[PDB]
Amino acid sequence: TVASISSGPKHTQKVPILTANETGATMPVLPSDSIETRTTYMHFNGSETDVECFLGRAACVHVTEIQNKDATGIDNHREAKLFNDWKINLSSLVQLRKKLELFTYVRFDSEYTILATASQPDSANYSSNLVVQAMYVPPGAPNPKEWDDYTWQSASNPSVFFKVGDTSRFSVPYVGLASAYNCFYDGYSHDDAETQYGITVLNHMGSMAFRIVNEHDEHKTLVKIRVYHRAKHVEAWIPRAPRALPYTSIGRTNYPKNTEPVIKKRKGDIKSY
Amino acid sequence: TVASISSGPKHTQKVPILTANETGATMPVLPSDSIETRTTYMHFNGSETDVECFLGRAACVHVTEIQNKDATGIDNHREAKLFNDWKINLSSLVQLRKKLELFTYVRFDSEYTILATASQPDSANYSSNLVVQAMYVPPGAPNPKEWDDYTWQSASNPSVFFKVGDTSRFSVPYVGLASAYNCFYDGYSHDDAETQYGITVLNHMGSMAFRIVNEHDEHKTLVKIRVYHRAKHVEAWIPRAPRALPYTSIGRTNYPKNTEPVIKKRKGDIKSY
Amino acid sequence: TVASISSGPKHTQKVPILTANETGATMPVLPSDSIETRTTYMHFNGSETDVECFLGR
Amino acid sequence: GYSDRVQQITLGNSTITTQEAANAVVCYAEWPEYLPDVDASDVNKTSKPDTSVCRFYTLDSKTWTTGSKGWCWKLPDALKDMGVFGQNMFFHSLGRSGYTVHVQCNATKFHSGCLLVVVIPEHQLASHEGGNVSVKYTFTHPGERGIDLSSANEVGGPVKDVLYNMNGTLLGNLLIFPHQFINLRTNNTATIVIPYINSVPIDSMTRHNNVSLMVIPIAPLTVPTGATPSLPITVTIAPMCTEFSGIRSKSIVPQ
Amino acid sequence: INYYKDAASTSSAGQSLSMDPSKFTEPVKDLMLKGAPALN
Amino acid sequence: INYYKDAASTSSAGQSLSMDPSKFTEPVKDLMLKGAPALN
Amino acid sequence: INYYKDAASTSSAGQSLSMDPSKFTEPVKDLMLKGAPALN
Amino acid sequence: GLPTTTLPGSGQFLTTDDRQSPSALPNYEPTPRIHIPGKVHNLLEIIQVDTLIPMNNTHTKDEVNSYLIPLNANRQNEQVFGTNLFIGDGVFKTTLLGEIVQYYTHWSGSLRFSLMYTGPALSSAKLILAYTPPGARGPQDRREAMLGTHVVWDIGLQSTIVMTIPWTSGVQFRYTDPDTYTSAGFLSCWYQTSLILPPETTGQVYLLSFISACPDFKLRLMKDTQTISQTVALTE
Amino acid sequence: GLPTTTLPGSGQFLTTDDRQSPSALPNYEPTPRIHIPGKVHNLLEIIQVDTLIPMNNTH
Amino acid sequence: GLPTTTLPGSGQFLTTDDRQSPSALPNYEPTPRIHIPGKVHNLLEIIQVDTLIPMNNTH
Numbered sequence A, B: 001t002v003a004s005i006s007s008g009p010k011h012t013q014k015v016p017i018l019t020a021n022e023t024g025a026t027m028p029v030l031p032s033d034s035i036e037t038r039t040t041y042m043h044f045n046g047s048e049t050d051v052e053c054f055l056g057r058a059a060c061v062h063v064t065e066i067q068n069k070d071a072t073g074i075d076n077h078r079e080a081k082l083f084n085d086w087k088i089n090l091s092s093l094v095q096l097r098k099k100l101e102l103f104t105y106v107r108f109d110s111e112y113t114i115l116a117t118a119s120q121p122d123s124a125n126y127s128s129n130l131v132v133q134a135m136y137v138p139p140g141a142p143n144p145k146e147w148d149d150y151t152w153q154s155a156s157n158p159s160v161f162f163k164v165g166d167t168s169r170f171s172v173p174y175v176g177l178a179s180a181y182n183c184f185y186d187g188y189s190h191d192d193a194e195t196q197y198g199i200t201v202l203n204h205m206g207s208m209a210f211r212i213v214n215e216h217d218e219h220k221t222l223v224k225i226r227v228y229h230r231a232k233h234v235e236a237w238i239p240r241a242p243r244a245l246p247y248t249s250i251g252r253t254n255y256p257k258n259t260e261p262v263i264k265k266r267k268g269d270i271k272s273y
Numbered sequence C: 001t002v003a004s005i006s007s008g009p010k011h012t013q014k015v016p017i018l019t020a021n022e023t024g025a026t027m028p029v030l031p032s033d034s035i036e037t038r039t040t041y042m043h044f045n046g047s048e049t050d051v052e053c054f055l056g057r
Numbered sequence D: 001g002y003s004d005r006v007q008q009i010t011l012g013n014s015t016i017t018t019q020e021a022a023n024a025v026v027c028y029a030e031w032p033e034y035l036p037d038v039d040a041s042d043v044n045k046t047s048k049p050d051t052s053v054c055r056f057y058t059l060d061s062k063t064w065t066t067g068s069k070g071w072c073w074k075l076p077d078a079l080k081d082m083g084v085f086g087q088n089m090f091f092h093s094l095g096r097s098g099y100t101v102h103v104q105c106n107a108t109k110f111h112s113g114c115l116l117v118v119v120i121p122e123h124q125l126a127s128h129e130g131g132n133v134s135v136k137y138t139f140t141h142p143g144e145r146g147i148d149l150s151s152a153n154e155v156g157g158p159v160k161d162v163l164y165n166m167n168g169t170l171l172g173n174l175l176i177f178p179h180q181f182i183n184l185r186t187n188n189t190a191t192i193v194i195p196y197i198n199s200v201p202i203d204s205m206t207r208h209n210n211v212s213l214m215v216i217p218i219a220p221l222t223v224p225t226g227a228t229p230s231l232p233i234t235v236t237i238a239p240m241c242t243e244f245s246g247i248r249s250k251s252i253v254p255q
Numbered sequence E, F, G: 001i002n003y004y005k006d007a008a009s010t011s012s013a014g015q016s017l018s019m020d021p022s023k024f025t026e027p028v029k030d031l032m033l034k035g036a037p038a039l040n
Numbered sequence H: 001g002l003p004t005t006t007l008p009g010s011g012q013f014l015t016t017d018d019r020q021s022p023s024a025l026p027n028y029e030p031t032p033r034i035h036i037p038g039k040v041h042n043l044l045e046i047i048q049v050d051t052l053i054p055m056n057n058t059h060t061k062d063e064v065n066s067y068l069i070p071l072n073a074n075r076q077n078e079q080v081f082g083t084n085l086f087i088g089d090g091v092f093k094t095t096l097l098g099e100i101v102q103y104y105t106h107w108s109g110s111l112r113f114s115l116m117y118t119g120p121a122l123s124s125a126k127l128i129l130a131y132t133p134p135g136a137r138g139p140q141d142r143r144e145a146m147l148g149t150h151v152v153w154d155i156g157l158q159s160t161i162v163m164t165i166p167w168t169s170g171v172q173f174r175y176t177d178p179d180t181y182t183s184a185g186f187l188s189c190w191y192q193t194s195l196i197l198p199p200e201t202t203g204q205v206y207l208l209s210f211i212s213a214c215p216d217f218k219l220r221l222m223k224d225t226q227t228i229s230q231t232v233a234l235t236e
Numbered sequence I, J: 001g002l003p004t005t006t007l008p009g010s011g012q013f014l015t016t017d018d019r020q021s022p023s024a025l026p027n028y029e030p031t032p033r034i035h036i037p038g039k040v041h042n043l044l045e046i047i048q049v050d051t052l053i054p055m056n057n058t059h
């Protein structure tokens, strides 16, 4: 492939460099339309800018935490982090969010990796070996209530059991209701005067609640869960302007008030170098 | 292959052993040009002197250390070794350095092995199990600041998570900007009167900052990281004189003052055996 | 596979929507027996409702 | 003698002529088309009023003055009240449509000024409150009036800050969306053909707007000496290939 | 070799090697030739 | 590839792709045609 | 068998078995024959 | 039982590796795809669309005005604007090009810089745009500027001028984050003759300026952008 | 000895995965199947049989 | 699931072994090679060039 062809002096009536940008086109002008060039080859394919590659590496999408401790006398397991759930979503932690929102609709399979590490902040004789059980509580299915409810039987709901310190990995097909996931949605769930606006009403998918299977030892053990997400088989439509201001909320486009100028001011003139 | 052919008495006008070294050549003289020889075969190929073999074994290129401890009240994580970064480079630890600098330009893929072991120098009930997360902070990408910054999300930057005591291994393609890496560079980054000289301005590649993912236990744990590097797919050009004096700096050729004579003095005469 | 065929106005002596449930049958009535439909395809096989799948986790 | 410059668009019972055009943009290089069966889901036969809905409606005019910040209309909202297009809209459960948008602004060879005319698929607005305040329905359904970016923040309304496109992105990058400029010195109209863009084959026309049309002054209007300091901008829009499905009782929407 | 039955479980896809910027860079209705006048 | 000798040790079965609701939806002795009168 | 997609991930290269010292040992412009006088 | 040996790296999680995994939802059937205009395959497809450069960066809070380069009637010989070409920083940084370049470590290729004139139709002007390849200082006067890559632009019916910064380089890749060795030059613009307004007209006229990449362009070695960060996870 | 590398997920138990296992009862012979009317293959077969709706829910 | 047995040496790191590894930079394209005079393939090539001997070591 040639990156530049050889081109010499020109004295024409045919001027490729004068255009009318009002038309909305970006005319494909090249170095050889306005200087004299020599042949050179590309030596490159643009492999690593493919959208599959761009969205295809694992990104941290969520960090939560649960603890193993005596539940005796706990009136609210959920509240003691005797377990927790994550109203699944991707636009929470942002590095990946800005990347996805370069597109309007996106379609992909997900590969999740879940790393779990334990901490024992206060005096323990040892490190126990805990098994985590993360399970998929899609929406309509009941929510556990205690860390050892009938829910955890999970007879119809996919669940994975792995050890703290290890990693769990599995992949979920594209579960969207439509043909693509909306990265943006300028609508409502119905014509209500006070209903919420945005994507929080669309990109529904319930949650994934984690717990330790082990009963309690004498000390307490903090287990912190990190969920990583990798898109595989990516398809993206309609590019948009990149995010400039900071984010404030999952699912709304809102930016913070009295934010700071995002364009760097010159130290000098327009004329400055 | 014959290592020596059979050759007998000679009384010629054709003298292969008289030459003129002023020409710059090393004339290919053999035993059979000046004594009577018998046939012998080589029985050998020179396999283990191939440059791929010479530069192809893992060498320790870096030892760093980070600790897991309560960051509560630490004003400078980087400074507490709550994590650290290594302004990646290869000429730091030297065994491998002298080997590479036998050549001027070198091109290869790298295979890294990272061994991490833990130490608990002061009273602990136990040994905790920590997961390390080393990640590639190429240059232009932001530097973390705390041991748990948004940076560690590493949504676009390759990162590996492995356990202390284990080893991590992955391989990076030749990331040089030019066609080869310069082992030497007699230039500057620009014609500045005070800019630095040497290769430190060329062989730029940012760094690789490690951290423990675990929160803190009651005791403190020292984790010491050793990075090993193995060249694979090696290509080397222009041999040079081997390094004689000791090294003083990454990237400059400078040797120490009042160094010692590097040539061993005879215990005796020129005539001595 | 078609999920619905195209069907238009009807003025017949042949009424598929009147039945006698006392018989014990569930007559296979479709949208196109009582409204005007357009063609659409199924795009689906019913894979995940197989009893092997239902009892297989 | 055809110029890129003169054009005629006849759609239904209405025709537009421009003698000073700058080509026309067809979003994503695709022209509006009806919904194919292979893509269909709802089993209902759809209704295609054709020429009674696919004609040109001219919205009420705006006034560009030196202080203008820009205006924003949403589709199909802007047309919610135009003739039979609008009736069909409130009466069917689902509908689908593409449009031809023609923005008009003429001046003289002594004026200067340049407007950006852009179509943004799925333009989800931001609340000026920050945090996770929502933007109430009424605020994102201004109707033919559209939203006036130089009007004041209101409560439950969107933010109207132009350097941020009403969503946290910079004005400068709106050029990645199908768009055309109106530069008084060149141009006097902008025309964009919009194919139907959605993640579902057909949708509700009232709970979801699928494009915002935005006209933004970028090089300020500068009139000749002692000229009146303003020009009107007119927007005429025509639904094209419209289809409605799931007819019934007639939606009732807030406010 | 796929070891698993479902398609979601396969590795990353392989490069589009599609690449056609004209839907974005030249969505004009009447074709513009480089070198010919923009507005006739 | 089965690595094991016994049939019980193989993985899940594969979709019946049988599907015939008539034993449940139309177990009538004399065949009913849709469109013809139910009771003659 | 490569298990990985990228070339960097393959094992070490295999012996040049190239070997030609003359660029280093005899870079003279006019060819010198062993046995003939060095300087004529 | 087949004998195996495990190698160094066993059990590691590399966020960039690409392997198979069990599906959690065996046998599930995804929604059919329908057609949607606009599919993107390569980021290289989109960085060829031009977007506006806030060249007039001299303000103090972001404003529509930093997109406008002003022009003065009747000045002769003088300089319209200047900038270095660190596409990952400074004016370029918020543009779509700048914004994507920042996801990669290295770039190579030609850039296309165009200027669209917005002054009254009855005015006229001749400007010179100059590209100065690495190695010299930003030009200080047109004489200096005109000795490097340049285009005399004659403002006419055809409203925009497209200047190309042809790839001039020793090393075949440059860093996107500004680096010296790897630096790309300067871009300046001066009056060639001068802007002239018709009667009954007055004041400043402005140029809009765009940037996009030529088909020439290469970007490689993905990394994280300095353009976005956060201090606590967001919630709904 | 063939060189291997284990990936993330090793040792996990996913209730939905489908693999082979050793039989605890090697060589055992199950009872023959006889014919039984009524076999169900898909839940889609049975949701087409109609059942009564307690529409008058007001009690 | 295929039955395996691990041998002595599993998990060891031998600095001299030569195996495959995942690439951290999937799909990256290295700079083209250009021609450079002087390529070395074997250390045996270079030890045939003669160099001076500090024979007079007595200093």
Ligand SMILES: CC[C@H]1COC(c2ccc(OCCCCCCCc3cc(C)no3)cc2)=N1
Residues within 6 Å of the ligand: A088, A089, A090, A091, A097, A100, A101, A106, A110, A134, A135, A136, A158, A159, A160, A170, A172, A175, A181, A182, A183, A203, A205, A208, H024
């Ligand atoms: C960032 C903007 C928009 C774009 O895409 C998304 C988005 C949001 C959510 C989403 O869902 C991913 C599917 C998650 C379900 C997987 C099942 C989890 C699980 C646990 C176990 C055990 N088995 O399965 C997929 C995409 N939001």
Ligand SMILES: CC[C@H]1COC(c2ccc(OCCCCCCCc3cc(C)no3)cc2)=N1
Residues within 6 Å of the ligand: B088, B089, B090, B091, B097, B100, B101, B106, B110, B134, B135, B136, B158, B159, B160, B170, B172, B175, B181, B182, B183, B203, B205, B208, J024
């Ligand atoms: C010794 C004299 C000269 C010669 O070569 C060199 C030299 C210097 C640096 C160099 O860089 C090696 C590339 C390192 C980048 C690899 C990425 C690291 C990483 C971590 C994770 C996780 N993924 O990737 C390669 C060669 N210096």
